[PDB]
Amino acid sequence: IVGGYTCGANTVPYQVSLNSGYHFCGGSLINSQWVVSAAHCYKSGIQVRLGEDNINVVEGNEQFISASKSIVHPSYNSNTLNNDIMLIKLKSAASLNSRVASISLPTSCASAGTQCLISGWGNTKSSGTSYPDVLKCLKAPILSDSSCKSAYPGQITSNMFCAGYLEGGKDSCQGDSGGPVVCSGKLQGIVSWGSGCAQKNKPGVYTKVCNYVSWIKQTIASN
Ligand SMILES: [NH3+]CCc1ccccc1
Numbered sequence: 001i002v003g004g005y006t007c008g009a010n011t012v013p014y015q016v017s018l019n020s021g022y023h024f025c026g027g028s029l030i031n032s033q034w035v036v037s038a039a040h041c042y043k044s045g046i047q048v049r050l051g052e053d054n055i056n057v058v059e060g061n062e063q064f065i066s067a068s069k070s071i072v073h074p075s076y077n078s079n080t081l082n083n084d085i086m087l088i089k090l091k092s093a094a095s096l097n098s099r100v101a102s103i104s105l106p107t108s109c110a111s112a113g114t115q116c117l118i119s120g121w122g123n124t125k126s127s128g129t130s131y132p133d134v135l136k137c138l139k140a141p142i143l144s145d146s147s148c149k150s151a152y153p154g155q156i157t158s159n160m161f162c163a164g165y166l167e168g169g170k171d172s173c174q175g176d177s178g179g180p181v182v183c184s185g186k187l188q189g190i191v192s193w194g195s196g197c198a199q200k201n202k203p204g205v206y207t208k209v210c211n212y213v214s215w216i217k218q219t220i221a222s223n
């Protein structure tokens, strides 16, 4: 996250870190046994780390549960990043409390103008690199579909939205991938892609979760 603030320990209780010996992607807990992330975060041998604030320090609220199955969206295209969403099932169910909690799926798509919370452990510089160890938070509005398509001519599908600031300085960034965009207490987006980070007229692009709600529900009902 570039241009954000420190969230505070366990103030984003649905936030997960996907670990393969190191943090590589964020994710969101949608119930005690299922995590949703970006399909471009797919990897074998994922351990899901819940209850994290400092990802380099065991602070006491963590639950490290290995993944038993990962399901990438059947129409994920890695060249266009259309349908950049995947589900991860935990080997055992997470123990849910004030600090580890699932986030609700949407019943409505969020509109342009809606303010949202984006969070992650990704890079905090738009030029060069500095990775935080504690979770960073950013409040950003969903942008109109027409300013999104004007920023990324020919690349925005109906399964994407833009969120952020057209004049840059504030954005999600590398390592924030797969993480949550929560608007009014519902998961509306997944950190998916963009052109660099926090650049003028290059806002973050996010997977539009409301389009995927019945694939998610069907898939967890059957796996
Ligand atoms: N400018 C969009 C933000 C972004 C950039 C790279 C990876 C994930 C998110």
Ligand SMILES: [Ca+2]
Residues within 6 Å of the ligand: 052, 053, 054, 055, 056, 057, 058, 059, 062
């Ligand atoms: Ca920790």
